[PDB]
Structure formats: C-alpha cells, structure tokens
C-alpha cells in the first residue's frame, strides 16, 4: 500500500 497507509 505504501504512502497512503502511512499518512492517508
């Protein structure tokens, strides 16, 4: 998932 599961 990356960036979204980190900040989204």
């Amino acid at each position: 998932c990356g960036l979204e599961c980190n900040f989204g």
Epitope: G2, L3, N6, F7, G8
Partner: antibody, heavy 119, light 113 residues
C-alpha cells in the same frame, strides 16, 4: 507555532492496559494532517506505531495491528494511544507527531513521555 | 519492512570540518507518484527528535544551509559543510514511501579529540 505535549503514567505493571495522551495546541487535529505515535527503545531504536487521520480514520504497524489502538477527542483537541496486555519490552519513550502525506514525513515532534514497565 | 542501513555507526569530527552520513535502503524509495520520501531526523541525548530534511533534499524551517541532502533509488546522503557544536547528537534516516514507516539505526556524531 504548533506544539505537542505527551502525558500519562510513568510506571506501569506488566499485563496491564495503560493509555497515553497527546495534547496539541496551535492547530486543529480535525483540519488537515495525520497524527502519529512513535516509540524509542533503549539503544535509541525508533518504531512507528500508527496514526489517526484528520477524517478520523486509523492505521497501525502490521507488527502491532491487534495489540494497540488509537482514538481521539475532538472537543478536547487530543488523541490517545491504548496499550494492551503490556510487557517489560514495551519500556520506551513514547512520542506523538504530526504527519504530512505531501512531504511523506513527520514535521512536528513532542517532548515524549517515558513509560517504564516493571513489577 | 524496508531496512535502513546507516554508515557509519559513530562519526568523529573536528569542529569546523566536513562530515557525511550515508543511508542505504533494502528497497527503492521512489514512489509511483514520482517522489522519493526520505527524511533526516536529528536528536540530542535527553532531547526529543526534530526533522532536519524531508523529500531527500528539502531543508526544514530553522535548518542552516551548511546541511545538504542527496541521493535517489536506494542510496542517500546527508552532508554537513562544517560541523558546529549545535550539530552534535544522533542522526536518523527515515522513510515514508513503504508501509510501514521505518527508521535507520542512527549515526552518533561526536567531537574528535
């Protein structure tokens, strides 16, 4: 500016379920950003724990997916970290942070709270 | 989890001299939106962390120009043109590209004596 302050118990006995509070001033936890928790173990090893999105959505580290949970209080402008069935290996300094998805980083940090676990 | 390896573990510097911390990742940090989310974090003992650089090379508000960041794909680098006393502490390379967010081990910056 924007500042974050951590609070909670300093000392906790193993197998307990304590809670930390991040009080934020200078910005509303409801407007834009993500709001995170990070812990720093002895040896100064840092681990990202999870966040509460401005929308109220949450997401956690896969290694802590079930053992922890993050909530918030919009009226007080605070968010919380709930530990569960704690052990002595959870002994760390717990930090809260604001995060941007545009910069892919944590921009503001709080002066953490040390939570020691011992019987 | 993408592992973040810093080099070296401890760094000895004479005040006024140049220094370099290298970071290497187990996976490329270039995201599908064409951005590389690598950040640099600074911390003194007893003090709380503080963001120094984000997006590889973009300096934070109060960060002096003597700090520079570089790198792409898997290799990244923070350089100080000249080291002051205000720079002493431990530096962490932190990545935001992959889930979950991970930190490097840290590089200790000490005075050469």
């Amino acid at each position: 500016d924007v500042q974050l302050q951590e609070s909670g118990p300093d000392l906790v006995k193993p197998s307990q379920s304590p809670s930390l509070t991040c009080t934020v001033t200078g910005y509303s936890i409801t407007s834009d950003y993500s709001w995170h928790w990070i812990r720093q173990f002895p040896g100064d090893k840092l681990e990202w724990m999870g966040y509460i999105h401005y929308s109220g959505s949450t997401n956690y580290n896969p290694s802590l997916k079930s053992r922890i949970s993050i909530t918030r209080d919009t009226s007080k402008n605070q968010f919380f970290l709930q530990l569960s069935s704690v052990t002595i290996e959870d002994t760390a300094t717990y930090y809260c942070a604001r995060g941007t998805i545009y910069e892919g980083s944590l921009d503001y940090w709080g002066q953490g709270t040390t939570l020691t676990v011992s019987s | 989890d993408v592992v973040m390896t810093q080099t070296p573990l401890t760094l000895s510097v004479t005040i006024g001299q140049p220094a370099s911390i290298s970071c290497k990742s187990s996976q490329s940090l270039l995201y599908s939106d064409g951005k590389t989310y690598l950040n640099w974090l600074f911390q003194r003992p007893g003090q709380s962390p503080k963001r120094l650089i984000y997006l590889v090379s973009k300096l934070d508000s109060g960060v002096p120009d003597r700090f520079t960041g570089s790198g792409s794909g898997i290799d990244f680098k923070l350089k100080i043109s000249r080291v002051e006393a205000e720079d002493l502490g431990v530096y962490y390379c932190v990545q935001g590209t992959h889930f979950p967010q991970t930190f490097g081990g840290g590089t200790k910056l000490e005075i050469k004596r």
